Amino acid sequence: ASLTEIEHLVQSVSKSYRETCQLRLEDLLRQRSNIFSREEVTGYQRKSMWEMWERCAHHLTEAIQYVVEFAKRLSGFMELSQNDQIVLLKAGAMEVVLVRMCRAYNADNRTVFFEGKYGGMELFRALGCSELISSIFDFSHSLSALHFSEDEIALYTALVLINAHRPGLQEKRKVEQLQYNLELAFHHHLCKTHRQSILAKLPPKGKLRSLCSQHVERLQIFQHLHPIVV
Numbered sequence: 001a002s003l004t005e006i007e008h009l010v011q012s013v014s015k016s017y018r019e020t021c022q023l024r025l026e027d028l029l030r031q032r033s034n035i036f037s038r039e040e041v042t043g044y045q046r047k048s049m050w051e052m053w054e055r056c057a058h059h060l061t062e063a064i065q066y067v068v069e070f071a072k073r074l075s076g077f078m079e080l081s082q083n084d085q086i087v088l089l090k091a092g093a094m095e096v097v098l099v100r101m102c103r104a105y106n107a108d109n110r111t112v113f114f115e116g117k118y119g120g121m122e123l124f125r126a127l128g129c130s131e132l133i134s135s136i137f138d139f140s141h142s143l144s145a146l147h148f149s150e151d152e153i154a155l156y157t158a159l160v161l162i163n164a165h166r167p168g169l170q171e172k173r174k175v176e177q178l179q180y181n182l183e184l185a186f187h188h189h190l191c192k193t194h195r196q197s198i199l200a201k202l203p204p205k206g207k208l209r210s211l212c213s214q215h216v217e218r219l220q221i222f223q224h225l226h227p228i229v230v
């Protein structure tokens with residue numbers, strides 16, 4: 001593929017991300033000073049695991065929507081079979097939500113944006129899954145260290161979604177081609193921005209997949225005991 005085709009793909013993913021980023025980076029950064037008081041923290045910690053489950057499920061479904069919209073705006077995604085689209089989204093939408101979380105994470109105080117303010121992992125005490133929440137905080141902490149640009153997130157999360165290795169892909173060669181184009185797009189933009197160094201610093205492919213697997217397992221248990229309608 002020619003260099004203008006690669007650049008166009010970079011511009012496209014970058015534009016698709018801008019339109020589906022949920023909140024602008026500037027807004028998240030600004031609101032870092034808007035932190036929960038000790039009383040608000042105590043408020044959340046006193047809630048039952050069921051009220052906390054409802055609040056986290058509401059936040060995660062709002063997050064998944066923007067990711068679904070992001071995927072729909074990706075070059076060649078709509079062209080795939082409904083089965084192949086679903087295979088890609090069921091496997092990768094939650095992995096993208098985990099990557100996008102680094103933008104609303106503040107490494108200075110180890111806080112996250114949740115329900116209009118910033119709070120530490122102590123906010124999620126009532127859920128009773130401190131190991132899982134501590135692992136999600138660790139993953140966001142390691143990505144925050146990379147100081148990802150908005151276009152770097154766009155390209156990386158596009159590559160999380162467009163994966164030819166997903167079990168159950170019918171049109172596997174189409175997906176292999178789209179993944180190949182996006183990989184040239186990602187390498188090209190990193191060279192143009194003098195950021196090829198981040199490639200080494202990225203999480204091992206298995207890390208994201210394993211953390212998402214753990215997260216979803218926990219959400220499935222909560223769904224079985226206390227279902228929530230979309």
Ligand SMILES: Cc1c(NC(=O)c2cccc(C#N)c2)ccc2c1c(C1CCN(C(=O)C3CCCC3)CC1)cn2C
Nearest residue numbers: 021022023056101104105112113114124136137140218
């Ligand atoms: C909320 C959040 C953000 N905020 C955002 O991503 C955010 C919020 C509002 C606009 C935008 C935007 N744009 C981003 C960023 C980093 C985060 C989190 C969290 C939560 C996630 C939800 N929770 C769960 O699923 C538990 C896990 C077990 C079952 C329920 C508890 C832990 C952890 N870290 C590291």
